[PDB]
Write a protein that binds this ligand. Structure first.
Ligand SMILES: CCCCCCCCOCCOCCOCCOCCOCCO
Length: 772
């Protein structure tokens, strides 16, 4: 809608960057095309399409309007075949904002290389859950989003921690606005599994081996959460929702200029959710606050200061899964889905806060530089108490394990990078050169020396959580871990021919972990990045890539000789085809991929049967593993009012024994989520459905009372979602979400410490949203 503009005549490059900023729109243009040209003056309250054609007056440029993006082109009478993947400079470093796009497909993305690229231009599997997708299906936290992310499987550790797999691996890489956090373990990682979506525009998941921008990390993927940003027009909304099991959510979101000119701009969001659960005596209060201010120091230098805060505060937390698999005498336990082995007072509260500042500067070069400063906190307060072990006994009694972990992780990050174009052999290429530093410091107390506790409960079958709370005693342990990451990276994107784009880059990494454990060090480790994209038609491109990653091992993972295993490492080999339709409104991708892991930690059963080094009592073995698999996806417009996100993923991951592994992650999965906006009489009704299918999944668990391995199978099952919204009013709308329509009873965990967890039964959510 009508925006306040003030772009005086200047280098067309600068004007377009200035335009993107003022218009809250992503401008994409070609550097060689705008380099010898200037904008004409625009001033005053204008609609952005009126504004841009006015700005482009005299330049010979055309505008392609595409959602929250505009691409500028300068057509010639010549042209010998179009350079679809031509180097393009961009006004927003993080990509296209999805908020208001009305789409389930992203516009442009920087998750791969820092370079702002379309999914079609990216030689990696990149899925995105867009703002609209999130709104439509009421995906209100990262757990919700993951569950709806094609190619991801969400499994439960416990009531307050989920696992996200991709391609055989737990994902343990989280970024915020393209900045990695430290996720060495749940110490550093509190709250990552729980982020509320109220503050985010989209989550982008980069599958494979993502060392280039993550640095040290897990295989599988990176989850990159892009924060909402301030807008140049005032706008906001209040949201209210009510769902099954006393699930209440409220939300506020306010954005706009804070001065008459618009040179300081802010966005604030507050969200609160208090919910019970299908699980007995489990409740959780979550709170989020977020403020961000953008100050324009001048036309081409912006300072951003922001803070965020999320508290996740549950009662009846489990330690491991909802119930034990086997009773005292070896039979499978058969319990309702409402069973919760958590004690009433058991709580794994997790909290997170960020304070962050950026400085962004556009150089009249068409280059941009950006400094990102982060202070992050991941805190936990975890007095846990849960039935665990082989229970009940015949007399229907059980025993509780109780331990308390409190702690905080303080983190500091500096990221500086420079990105821009450059001529070489007559053609335009682009480059990112960057450097990064993070220091993160974990400090905690643990308590396991319970003083005078009677940890037995008299009634398992009617377990309520109604057990006493122990005297925790004095601290049993003081955590003091310190992780230091230093990185330097460079990626070039050479426009080799009119259809060929070659990506060559890498990261050099310095990783130090210091504290109570023997010091872990890796210096000057090189992480290569090699990719190619070949254009086939106006529509299809093929791409191939070789990417890598490592994670220095947990310090308990030592070997036969008490030497720390070499870092857990992997390369992803990928070849595939990407299609782009309707001017980027619909994307399809088909990929074959292979992850070769090496130095994957493993028990070492032959040593461990009778240790022979007094030095180590429980060594680990560092083996190779492989993931073979393929993936198909589609997202975007299928017809005018009709959006989808869908995916198909096949995987098998075997280790150096040849045995299948991550067998709780199904070998085959399908996701399809769709919504349809009607026209004419009922153009105010959005109707929507979704399905998730997954094939066989199983776990080998040991039945202690019978001294034997058992197989726990989860037969293939569907989950069906349904969704409807009515825009009753310009400013007010109502929604219903029904999840798991057929009330499929299934498991999200079998075998995590000999326990099991159910997935959500049929639940509803009703919401109204009020836009000012
Ligand atoms: C050093 C710590 C950093 C703290 C950062 C906290 C930032 C909190 O800022 C919240 C302000 O957000 C502004 C909300 O935007 C609404 C603008 O509308 C104001 C009134 O509108 C006038 C008429 O349109």
């Amino acid at each position: 809608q009508e925006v306040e503009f003030d772009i005086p005549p200047q280098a067309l490059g600068s004007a377009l960057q200035e335009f993107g900023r003022q218009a809250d729109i992503q401008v994409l243009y070609r550097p060689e095309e705008v380099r010898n040209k200037r904008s004409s003056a625009i001033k005053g309250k204008l609609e952005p399409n009126q504004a841009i054609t006015e700005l482009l007056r005299g330049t010979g440029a055309s505008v392609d309007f595409q959602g929250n993006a505009i691409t500028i082109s300068v057509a010639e009478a010549a042209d010998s075949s179009v350079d679809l993947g031509a180097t393009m400079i961009t006004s927003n470093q993080l990509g296209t904002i999805t908020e208001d796009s009305g789409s389930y497909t992203p516009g442009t993305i920087a998750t791969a290389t820092r370079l702002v690229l379309t999914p079609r231009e990216t030689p990696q599997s990149i899925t995105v859950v867009t703002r609209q997708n999130m709104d439509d299906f009421g995906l209100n936290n990262i757990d919700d989003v993951m569950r709806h992310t094609p190619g991801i499987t969400v499994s439960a550790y416990d009531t307050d921690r989920n696992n996200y797999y991709a391609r055989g691996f737990s994902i343990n890489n989280f970024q915020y606005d393209g900045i990695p956090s430290t996720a060495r373990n749940v110490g550093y990682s509190a709250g990552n599994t729980l982020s509320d979506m109220a503050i985010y525009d989209r989550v982008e998941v980069l599958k494979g081996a993502t060392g280039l921008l993550t640095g040290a990390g897990s295989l599988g993927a990176t989850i990159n959460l892009i924060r909402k940003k301030p807008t140049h027009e005032f706008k906001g909304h209040v949201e209210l929702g009510a769902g099954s099991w006393d699930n209440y959510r409220s939300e506020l979101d306010v954005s706009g200029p804070l001065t008459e000119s618009g040179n300081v701009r802010g966005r604030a969001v507050a969200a609160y959710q208090d919910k019970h659960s299908f699980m007995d005596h489990y409740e959780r209060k979550t709170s989020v606050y977020y403020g961000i201010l953008e100050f324009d120091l001048n036309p081409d230098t912006m300072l951003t200061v922001g803070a965020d805060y999320q508290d996740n505060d549950p009662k009846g937390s489990g330690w491991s899964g909802s119930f034990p698999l086997f009773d005292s005498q070896g039979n499978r336990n058969d319990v309702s889905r409402s069973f919760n082995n958590g004690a009433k007072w058991s709580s794994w509260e997790q909290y997170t806060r960020t304070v962050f500042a950026n400085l962004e500067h556009n150089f009249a070069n068409g280059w941009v530089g950006k400094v990102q400063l982060d202070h992050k906190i991941n805190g936990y307060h975890a007095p846990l108490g849960a039935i665990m072990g082989d229970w009940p006994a015949p007399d229907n009694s059980a025993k509780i394990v109780a331990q308390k972990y409190t702690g905080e992780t303080k983190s500091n990050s500096l990221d500086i990078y420079l990105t821009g174009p450059f001529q070489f052999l007559g053609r335009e290429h682009e480059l990112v050169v960057g450097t990064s530093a993070s220091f993160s410091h974990w400090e905690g107390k643990s308590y396991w020396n319970l003083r005078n506790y009677d940890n037995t409960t008299d009634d398992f079958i009617n377990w309520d959580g109604d057990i006493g709370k122990p005297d925790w005693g004095t601290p049993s342990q003081y955590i003091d871990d310190k992780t230091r990451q230093l990185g330097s990276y460079m990626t070039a994107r050479f426009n080799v021919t009119d259809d060929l784009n070659l990506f060559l880059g890498g990261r050099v990494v310095d990783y130090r972990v210091t504290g109570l454990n023997p010091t872990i060090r890796e210096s000057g480790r090189f992480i290569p990045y090699v990719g190619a994209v070949y254009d086939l038609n106006d529509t299809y491109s093929v791409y191939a890539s070789y990417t890598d990653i490592f994670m220095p091992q947990d310090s308990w993972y030592r070997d036969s000789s008490n030497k720390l295993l070499e870092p857990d490492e992997g390369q992803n080999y990928e070849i595939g085809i990407k299609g782009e339709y309707l001017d980027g409104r619909l994307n399809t991708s088909l990929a074959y991929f292979e992850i070769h892991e090496e130095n994957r930690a493993e028990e070492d059963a032959l040593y461990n049967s009778k240790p022979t080094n007094p030095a180590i009592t429980y060594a680990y073995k560092g083996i190779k593993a492989k993931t073979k698999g393929y993936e198909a996806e589609i997202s975007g417009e299928l017809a005018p009012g009709w959006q989808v996100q869908a995916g198909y993923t096949h995987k098998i991951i075997r280790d150096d024994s040849g045995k299948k592994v991550s067998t709780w992650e199904p070998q085959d999965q399908l996701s399809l989520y769709t919504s349809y906006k009607f026209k004419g009489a009922l153009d105010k009704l959005t109707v929507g459905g979704g399905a998730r299918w997954q094939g066989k999944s199983w776990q080998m668990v040991y039945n202690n009372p019978r001294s034997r391995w058992e197989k726990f199978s989860q037969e293939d099952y569907w989950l069906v979602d349904l969704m409807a919204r009515y825009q009753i009013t310009d400013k007010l709308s109502a929604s219903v979400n029904v999840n798991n329509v057929f009330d499929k009873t299934y498991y999200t965990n079998i075998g995590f410490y000999t326990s099991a967890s159910y997935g959500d039964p049929r639940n509803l959510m009703f919401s109204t949203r009020w836009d000012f």
